[PDB]
Please model this.
Amino acid sequence: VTDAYWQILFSVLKVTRNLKELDLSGNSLSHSAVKSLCKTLRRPRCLLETLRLAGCGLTAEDCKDLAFGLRANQTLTELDLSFNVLTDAGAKHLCQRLRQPSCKLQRLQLVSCGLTSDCCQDLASVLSASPSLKELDLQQNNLDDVGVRLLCEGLRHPACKLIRLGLDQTTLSDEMRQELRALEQEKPQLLIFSRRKP
Model:
């Protein structure tokens, strides 16, 4: 895929009405294409509910553009950014927006995004404050016990809306695995899953 292609798609999306899902996963988006997608998302006529950009070559700077694009939007409820090297800096840009009281996003996937424990204080601020986030998938990221303990500080908040958390647990310590099971006992509405424990 080239930007020339994407300009045809985004011109067509202007004439489209009632489009609820857009899945571009597996096709490279340049920074220019990301910016033009963000213009698309900002339109008052945009009714998209699901946007999937998994495996599209996105980087941290793209998260800044996407977060500002979501600021203008009351329809998008699911966003997939998996299989992109977002890094903790990219996650920080997303979390600034997701913690705002105006957010409507319900489902977010960040599988294999180059995240470490250094983004987990930002993700915990989301868990404790978001009005809308129900499902968060963080599998295939090296969070470690330090990061997972920060996540649990936000999951324990009684205002946390999360009911599904995808999380790698195999390399976590036994003490951490015990603390996660205790959290699950305490918050029976919450399912922690992984590709090993579906």
